[PDB]
């Protein structure tokens, strides 16, 4: 299949090259997945999202996302036009306020949470959660992100955006989950994007395209949203048979452009995701 004029971060998982503008993936486009966005909640209501999302969990007075940034994550794994997974069901966990804040305790709630909840869902081709969130290092944090992965979800985390080393970063500094830096439309290393060993892979990260809250859209920057994508194309590959929750992050390293990216520090890896697909 091939969607035209789509974001640039979605052209950019499909293409050997920067500087295109059509989307290609196969038309499973992971449906039988679920993606789980833990995050400030996703607005289900998004004509975008065609019934797919469902709020499962708050740990606030609402399940509103009052924010905008869970919806934006939500809609690069998923949406119709800003999604990598066009057929995943999407599942929201507000583990973040409408200020984008949550004590880590709340958020380790949230992990456990999916590691548990993902029984009561039909998910046959496959489990992945989204983590768009972090901040400094805790073994707590790292150790329930460790959970879920172990408990057999894919589990993608952002680096985050200090142009630091994100080995000083929770969850990013967990080494069993998949750890996304982020880059720009020309292949540079994103100049807010963390960096460092502990680093995975890369995703678009700089001026994405996708769902916001009121039914609008809006393009924003971050490893929150190179981490979407990530998410979004473990699904899609799940669905394909191609790899496993255990095996995705690996997979997606071993499949990705190697050598594209500028601006990469040496130790960090130079791996840009990619589905091979055409
Ligand atoms: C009609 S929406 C197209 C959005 C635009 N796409 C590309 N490829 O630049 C972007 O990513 O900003």
Redesign the pocket.
Same mark, same amino acid.
């Given at each position: 299949a091939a969607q035209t004029?789509?974001?640039?971060?979605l052209?950019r998982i499909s293409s050997t090259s920067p500087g295109? @503008?059509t989307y290609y993936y196969d038309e499973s486009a992971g449906q039988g997945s679920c993606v789980y966005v833990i995050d400030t909640g996703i607005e289900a209501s998004h004509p975008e999202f065609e019934g797919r999302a469902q709020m499962v969990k708050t740990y606030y007075y609402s399940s509103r996302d009052g924010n905008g940034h869970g919806t934006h994550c939500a809609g690069t794994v998923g949406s119709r036009?800003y999604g990598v997974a066009k057929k995943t069901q999407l599942f929201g966990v507000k583990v973040l306020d409408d200020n984008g804040s949550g004590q880590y305790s709340t958020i380790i709630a949230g992990m456990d949470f999916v590691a548990s909840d993902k029984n009561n869902r039909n998910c046959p081709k496959g489990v992945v959660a989204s983590l768009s969130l972090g901040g400094g290092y805790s073994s707590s944090v790292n150790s329930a992100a460790a959970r879920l992965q172990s408990s057999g979800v894919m589990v993608a985390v952002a680096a985050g955006n200090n142009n630091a080393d994100a080995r000083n970063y929770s969850p990013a500094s967990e080494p069993s989950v998949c750890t996304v830096g982020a880059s720009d439309?020309y292949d540079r290393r994103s100049s807010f994007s963390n960096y460092g060993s502990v680093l995975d892979i890369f995703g678009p990260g700089t001026?994405?395209?996708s769902t916001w809250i009121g039914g609008s859209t809006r @393009?924003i920057s971050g490893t929150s949203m190179a981490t979407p994508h990530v998410a979004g194309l473990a699904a899609y590959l799940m669905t394909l048979g191609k790899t496993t929750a255990a095996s995705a992050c690996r997979y997606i390293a071993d499949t990705a452009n190697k050598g594209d990216l500028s601006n990469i520090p040496f130790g960090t890896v130079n791996l840009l995701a990619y589905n091979n697909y055409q």
């Amino acid at each position: 299949a091939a969607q035209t004029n789509a974001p640039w971060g979605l052209a950019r998982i499909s293409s050997t090259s920067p500087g295109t @503008s059509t989307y290609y993936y196969d038309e499973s486009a992971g449906q039988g997945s679920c993606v789980y966005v833990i995050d400030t909640g996703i607005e289900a209501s998004h004509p975008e999202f065609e019934g797919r999302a469902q709020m499962v969990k708050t740990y606030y007075y609402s399940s509103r996302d009052g924010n905008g940034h869970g919806t934006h994550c939500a809609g690069t794994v998923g949406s119709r036009t800003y999604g990598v997974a066009k057929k995943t069901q999407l599942f929201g966990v507000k583990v973040l306020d409408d200020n984008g804040s949550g004590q880590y305790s709340t958020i380790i709630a949230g992990m456990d949470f999916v590691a548990s909840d993902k029984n009561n869902r039909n998910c046959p081709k496959g489990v992945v959660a989204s983590l768009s969130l972090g901040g400094g290092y805790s073994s707590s944090v790292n150790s329930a992100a460790a959970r879920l992965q172990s408990s057999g979800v894919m589990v993608a985390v952002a680096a985050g955006n200090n142009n630091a080393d994100a080995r000083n970063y929770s969850p990013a500094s967990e080494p069993s989950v998949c750890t996304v830096g982020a880059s720009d439309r020309y292949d540079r290393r994103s100049s807010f994007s963390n960096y460092g060993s502990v680093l995975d892979i890369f995703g678009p990260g700089t001026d994405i395209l996708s769902t916001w809250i009121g039914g609008s859209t809006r @393009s924003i920057s971050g490893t929150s949203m190179a981490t979407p994508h990530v998410a979004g194309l473990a699904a899609y590959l799940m669905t394909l048979g191609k790899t496993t929750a255990a095996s995705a992050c690996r997979y997606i390293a071993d499949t990705a452009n190697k050598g594209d990216l500028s601006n990469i520090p040496f130790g960090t890896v130079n791996l840009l995701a990619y589905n091979n697909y055409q």
